[PDB]
Amino acid sequence: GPVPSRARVYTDVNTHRPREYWDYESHVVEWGNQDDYQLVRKLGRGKYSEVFEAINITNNEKVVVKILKPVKKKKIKREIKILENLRGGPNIITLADIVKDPVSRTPALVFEHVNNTDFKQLYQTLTDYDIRFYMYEILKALDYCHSMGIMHRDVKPHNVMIDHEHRKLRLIDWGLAEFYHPGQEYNVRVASRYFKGPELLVDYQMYDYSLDMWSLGCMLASMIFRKEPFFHGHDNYDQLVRIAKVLGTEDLYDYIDKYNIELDPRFNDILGRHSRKRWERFVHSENQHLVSPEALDFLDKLLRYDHQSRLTAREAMEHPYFYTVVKDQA
Amino acid sequence: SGPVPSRARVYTDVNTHRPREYWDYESHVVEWGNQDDYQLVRKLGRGKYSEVFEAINITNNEKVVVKILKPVKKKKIKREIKILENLRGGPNIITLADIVKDPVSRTPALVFEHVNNTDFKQLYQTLTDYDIRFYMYEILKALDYCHSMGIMHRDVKPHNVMIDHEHRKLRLIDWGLAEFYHPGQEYNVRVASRYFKGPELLVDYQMYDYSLDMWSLGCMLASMIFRKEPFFHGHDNYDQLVRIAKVLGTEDLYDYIDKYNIELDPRFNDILGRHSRKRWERFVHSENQHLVSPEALDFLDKLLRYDHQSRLTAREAMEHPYFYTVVKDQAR
Amino acid sequence: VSWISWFCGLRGNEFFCEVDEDYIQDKFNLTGLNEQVPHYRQALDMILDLEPDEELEDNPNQSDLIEQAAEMLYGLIHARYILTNRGIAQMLEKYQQGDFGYCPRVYCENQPMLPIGLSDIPGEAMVKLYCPKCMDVYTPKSSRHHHTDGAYFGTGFPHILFMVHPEYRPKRPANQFVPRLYGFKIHPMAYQLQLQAASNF
Amino acid sequence: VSWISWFCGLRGNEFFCEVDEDYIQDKFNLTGLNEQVPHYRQALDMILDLEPDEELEDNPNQSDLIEQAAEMLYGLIHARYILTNRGIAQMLEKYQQGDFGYCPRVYCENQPMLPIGLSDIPGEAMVKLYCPKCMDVYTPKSSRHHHTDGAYFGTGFPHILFMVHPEYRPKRPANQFVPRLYGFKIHPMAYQLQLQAASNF
Numbered sequence A: 001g002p003v004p005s006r007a008r009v010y011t012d013v014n015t016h017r018p019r020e021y022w023d024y025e026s027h028v029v030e031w032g033n034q035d036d037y038q039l040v041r042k043l044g045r046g047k048y049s050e051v052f053e054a055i056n057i058t059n060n061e062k063v064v065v066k067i068l069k070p071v072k073k074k075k076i077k078r079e080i081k082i083l084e085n086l087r088g089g090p091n092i093i094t095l096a097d098i099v100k101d102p103v104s105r106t107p108a109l110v111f112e113h114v115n116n117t118d119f120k121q122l123y124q125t126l127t128d129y130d131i132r133f134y135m136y137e138i139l140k141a142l143d144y145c146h147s148m149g150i151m152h153r154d155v156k157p158h159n160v161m162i163d164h165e166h167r168k169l170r171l172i173d174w175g176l177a178e179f180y181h182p183g184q185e186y187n188v189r190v191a192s193r194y195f196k197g198p199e200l201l202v203d204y205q206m207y208d209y210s211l212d213m214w215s216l217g218c219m220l221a222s223m224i225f226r227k228e229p230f231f232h233g234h235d236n237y238d239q240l241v242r243i244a245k246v247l248g249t250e251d252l253y254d255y256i257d258k259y260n261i262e263l264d265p266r267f268n269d270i271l272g273r274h275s276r277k278r279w280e281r282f283v284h285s286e287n288q289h290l291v292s293p294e295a296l297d298f299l300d301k302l303l304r305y306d307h308q309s310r311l312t313a314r315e316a317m318e319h320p321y322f323y324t325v326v327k328d329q330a
Numbered sequence B: 001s002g003p004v005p006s007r008a009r010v011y012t013d014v015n016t017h018r019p020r021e022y023w024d025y026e027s028h029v030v031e032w033g034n035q036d037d038y039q040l041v042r043k044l045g046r047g048k049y050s051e052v053f054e055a056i057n058i059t060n061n062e063k064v065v066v067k068i069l070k071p072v073k074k075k076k077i078k079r080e081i082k083i084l085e086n087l088r089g090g091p092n093i094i095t096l097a098d099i100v101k102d103p104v105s106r107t108p109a110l111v112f113e114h115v116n117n118t119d120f121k122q123l124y125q126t127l128t129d130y131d132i133r134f135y136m137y138e139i140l141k142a143l144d145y146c147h148s149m150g151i152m153h154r155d156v157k158p159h160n161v162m163i164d165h166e167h168r169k170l171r172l173i174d175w176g177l178a179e180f181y182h183p184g185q186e187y188n189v190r191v192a193s194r195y196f197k198g199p200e201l202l203v204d205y206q207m208y209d210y211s212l213d214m215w216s217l218g219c220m221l222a223s224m225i226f227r228k229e230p231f232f233h234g235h236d237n238y239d240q241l242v243r244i245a246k247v248l249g250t251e252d253l254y255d256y257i258d259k260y261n262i263e264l265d266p267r268f269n270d271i272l273g274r275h276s277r278k279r280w281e282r283f284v285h286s287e288n289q290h291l292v293s294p295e296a297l298d299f300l301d302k303l304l305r306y307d308h309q310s311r312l313t314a315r316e317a318m319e320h321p322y323f324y325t326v327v328k329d330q331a332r
Numbered sequence C, D: 001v002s003w004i005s006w007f008c009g010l011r012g013n014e015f016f017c018e019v020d021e022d023y024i025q026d027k028f029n030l031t032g033l034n035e036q037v038p039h040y041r042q043a044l045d046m047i048l049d050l051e052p053d054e055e056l057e058d059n060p061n062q063s064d065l066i067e068q069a070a071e072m073l074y075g076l077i078h079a080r081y082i083l084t085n086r087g088i089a090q091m092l093e094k095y096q097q098g099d100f101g102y103c104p105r106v107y108c109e110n111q112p113m114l115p116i117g118l119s120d121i122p123g124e125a126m127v128k129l130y131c132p133k134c135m136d137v138y139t140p141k142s143s144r145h146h147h148t149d150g151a152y153f154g155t156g157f158p159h160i161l162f163m164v165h166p167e168y169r170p171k172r173p174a175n176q177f178v179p180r181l182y183g184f185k186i187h188p189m190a191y192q193l194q195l196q197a198a199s200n201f
C-alpha cells in the first residue's frame, strides 16, 4: 500500500495529553442563557450553519451568532472542543458562549465581533508590507493550533477576519478542524477546492499540519500576484492539473512514487506533461510592487507536492519575507 | 272676548329699548373656535335635543364639558348661543367657553366649565335646613339676573342646576328652552318639565312672563323641604293640574281662569271636581320635620300661586325671612 | 313580509339592524335629509310600508334609481338610529351573537367586532369592523360586506357604545406576538436596517 | 401527475410550495425525522414517486394513517426547505402573486402577507399569516387554511426571509386609525375609565 507519513513538528502531542482534550466525543457543553441574544443582521450562511450579527442585550455589545444545524452529533462536539482548547490563543477567534434552542435543540455559537473590512475590496488595496504583516499574523495563529495538535484544514481568505482599522486579524471557521494523531488516516474531502493540497487530490489519507501550509501558500500567491483564486480549477481533477501546469509534472510523479500512492487512472490520462514554470512568470505591471525575491522564495518553499518537504509554521516565520515585520516589534 | 292680556311686574320693558343685537338671536353669528382642542372622555348625559360629554381640553389640560347640539332648529341653536353669551359672567350662570362645530357634518357643539357635581340623586336626602336655604338663595341670585336681562329660563329643575357641595358652588345650566321676554307677545306652552309646569302652561295661556320660573322654583323648594321628588307627580298635562288642584284647592283655580277669561279645555272641568285648599303643614312628617319652618312654608305659599302675576319675584323672594340666616352670613 | 325585515334579512346585510316603528314615524329624527337623498318621499314611503305612486304610471321602469335610492335613505337613518340607546341595545345584542364577525388578529383571540365606517360621507368608503380589544379597524372577512357604505354606520358608533356601556370594554390582550428565529428574539435594529435597505431600491 | 405537484395543487394547500427534486434525494437534509413521523419510508417513497410495498397494496389498514402520515413528512420537509435560499425564492415568488392573502388591517392597505406557524411543534397550532407592514400575525380569511399545521412553515420563516432580502421590507404605514365621535378625538383617559368599569362586573 501507500507509504506512512508523520508530522515533523508537534508529532506527539495528542498521544501524551490527557484524553479530555483530543477526545471531543466525551465532552460536555456549558449551555448558557440564550435569551441574552437578539438577531440583527445576516452576515452569511452555508451548508453547515447560518451566521447572524446579534446584540447581547446584557452588555449592549455586538456579538456574532453562528447557528449550527443538526449535522453530526460528533462534528458539533469537535468544533466546540477545539474552540475552547485554542480559546485565548493568538489571532484565534473567541468562543464567548454556547447557547441552544430549548425547543429544537439546535445549538448556536457566539463569537467576538470583528468589524471586517471585507477582503473582496481589501486585497486590491493592500501594499507589500501589509501582505507581509497579516501573513505573519496567520502564521502566528497556525503555529499555535499546530502546536496544540490541531489542524485547521480550511485556511482560506473567507475564513480569516481582518479589521484594517486596528490592524486586527482573526482566524475563524473551525468546523473542519481536527486533532492530529500520528499514523492515523483522515478524510480527503476537506478544505476549499482552490486550496486543496496535492495529498487530498490524490487520495492520501495520512496528512498532517502541513496541509494548512499549502492553503497558506495559495493565499500568498493569490495576493502577491493579484489572482483570486490562483489555482482556479473546476473539479478535484482539473485542480491538480492547474497545479501541475505551474509546479510541473516532474515533481508530481516523484511525489507519487515516493509514497507509492495509488493514483486514480483518470489523472495520468489527462495530466500530460507540463514543465515547472518560474514564479517570476506570473509577475506583471500590476502585481510588481508586491513581488520580491524573498516573497517568491518563501512561496516556493510553501507550495510543494511533498507535504513533508513543506515549510512549517515556525520555519515560515523565520524567513527573510518577515524581516521588516519582526524588527518592527521593538 | 278672548283671554285677558298680562304683563311682567318687574323688568317689563328691557328688550323693547335694548339694541336689536340682543333679543334678536336669529341675526346673530357664531364665533366658531378650533374644535381639535377637545377630546371626549366620558358621557355625562344625553337627551332629545343634544348629547353631553365630559372632555379634556388638551391645550390647557383642564376638564371641559362638551354639549353636542344636533341639527334641531336653525333658530333654536341661535337662541341658546346668544343667551349664554348675554348671561355670560353672571352670578351662578354657567360659562360658555367656546363654540366649536364638526367641519364635516356642520353639527355644532358647546363647551362649558366643569363643575364636579355631587349628584342630587344622593344629595337632596343629605341636605340640612341651612343648606336648602343657602342654595335656594343662590338660584334666586341667578334667576333675578336673567330676568333682569329679559331672559326667561322656562326649564328650572334640579336636573338643570349643578351643585358642587365641596366648595358650596351652584350653577344654572340648560338654556335651550330659555327665551327673551317681550311684553304682550305670546309664547309656547309646551316647555319645561311636566312636574314643574306652571298652571298657565297647563291651561294653554300663551302670554306668560318671568314668573313661570318662580313656580318651578316653588316645586323645587317643596320637593326638598318635604322630601318628595317630585312633589307634583302627574302622568300627563291633565293629571298634573289635578295633582296641583288637590293641594292648592279648586277654589283659587277657577278664580285664576275667570280673571283672565281663559278658554279652559272641556276635559278639565269634568275631571277637576272639587278639592279644598290643603295646608302646607299637612305634608310634614318625622323625616322632613327638620327642614320645615314657619318661614319656609310662608315663602313656599307665596311661590306656588295660580295667578302668575301674584307670585313672588326673584328679588322679592330674596327679601324673605327664609333667607335671613343666609344674607347675614355675608359679612366676611 | 315588511320592507325593513326583508332588507335586513338579505345576504350582505347581516350588519344591519331593523329600525323601530316610531323612530321613522317621528319626523323629528329625519330632518336635513330632503336634499341629501333623491326622491325623498319615494324612498320614505317605500320603506315605511306605504302604497307606491297611486296614479303616476305604477310600472316601476328602472326603479334602481328609486328602490336603491330607498336603500340609501334607510342606510342614513340607520346611522342616526344606532347612536340612540334603543339602537345601541339592538346592535349590542347582535354583538353578543357575533353577527359582525371576530377579530383577525391571533392575540385578540376571536374578539367579536363592531361595524364602523371610515367616513360619514356616502360613496367614499365601505363598511369596516372595529375590534374593541385591539382598537383598530379591519376589512370584513367575507366578500358579502364589501359592497356596503360605511356612512350607513357612522364613525362614532362603536365609540359611543362603550361610552354608555363601559362594562363591555374587553381586557387588553394578555399576550402578544414575539418573533422567534431559531429560538432567538429579534433586535429592533434589524427592522431599522431593513427599512434603510428598502429605501435604496 | 406527480405527488408533490398533486398535493400542492389541492384546495387548502395554496400556501405550500413544491419542494425541489434533489432536496429530498439528498439524505443530508432529512436527518432526525425517523422517530418523528410514523412509517418513515412509506411516507418518503410515496412522496418521492416510488412504487408501493410491492404486494399488499390495498390500503394497509386504511392508508389515512399512511397517506396522511406522508403529508406529515412533506410538511416538515417544507419547513426546513423554505429556510434555504432556493425555498425562500419560491415563497417570495408566491408572495409577489399574493397566494397567502392580504392584511386584514385597513391601514396596512392590502399588504400581502407571509405564512407563519406559532409553534414548530405539530398539532399545537394551525398556520397563521404575518404582515411585514404591521408586523403582527392574523387568522387566515378563508376556512380552507384553518386545517393546516403551522409547524409545516416554522416560526422564523418570514423573519429569515427579510434577513436575506431586506429590500422587500415595506415602509411602515403612513396613516393610522383615529377615533372620531361627532368630530371629536377620544382622550386615552376614556379607555382607562372603561377598563376600571369593566373590572366591576
Ligand SMILES: Nc1ncnc2c1ncn2[C@@H]1O[C@H](COP(=O)(O)OP(=O)(O)CP(=O)(O)O)[C@@H](O)[C@H]1O
Residues within 6 Å of the ligand: A043, A044, A045, A046, A047, A048, A049, A050, A051, A064, A066, A111, A112, A113, A114, A115, A116, A158, A159, A161, A172, A173, A175
Ligand atoms: N467575528 C466576526 N466579525 C464579523 N463577522 C464574522 C465574525 N465571525 C464570523 N463572521 C462572519 O462569518 C461568516 C463566515 O461564516 P462561517 O465560515 O462560520 O460559516 P461556515 O463555516 O458554516 C460555511 P463554510 O464552512 O462553507 O465556510 C463571514 O462571512 C463573516 O461575515
Ligand SMILES: Nc1ncnc2c1ncn2[C@@H]1O[C@H](COP(=O)(O)OP(=O)(O)CP(=O)(O)O)[C@@H](O)[C@H]1O
Residues within 6 Å of the ligand: B044, B045, B046, B047, B048, B049, B050, B051, B052, B065, B067, B094, B112, B113, B114, B115, B116, B117, B159, B160, B162, B173, B174, B176
Ligand atoms: N358644567 C357642568 N359640569 C358637570 N356636568 C355638567 C355640566 N354642565 C352640564 N353637565 C351635565 O349636563 C347634563 C344635562 O345636559 P343638558 O341639560 O344640557 O341636556 P338637555 O338640555 O339637551 C336634555 P333636557 O332639555 O331634557 O334637560 C347633566 O346631567 C350634567 O351632568
Ligand SMILES: [Mg+2]
Residues within 6 Å of the ligand: A158, A159, A173
Ligand atoms: Mg467559512
Ligand SMILES: [Mg+2]
Residues within 6 Å of the ligand: A154, A173, A174, A175, A176
Ligand atoms: Mg466552515
Ligand SMILES: [Mg+2]
Residues within 6 Å of the ligand: B159, B160, B174
Ligand atoms: Mg337639562
Ligand SMILES: [Mg+2]
Residues within 6 Å of the ligand: B155, B174, B175, B176, B177
Ligand atoms: Mg334642556
Ligand SMILES: [Zn+2]
Residues within 6 Å of the ligand: C103, C104, C105, C108, C111, C131, C132, C133, C134, C135, C136
Ligand atoms: Zn382585535
Ligand SMILES: [Zn+2]
Residues within 6 Å of the ligand: D103, D104, D105, D108, D111, D131, D132, D133, D134, D135, D136
Ligand atoms: Zn398588516
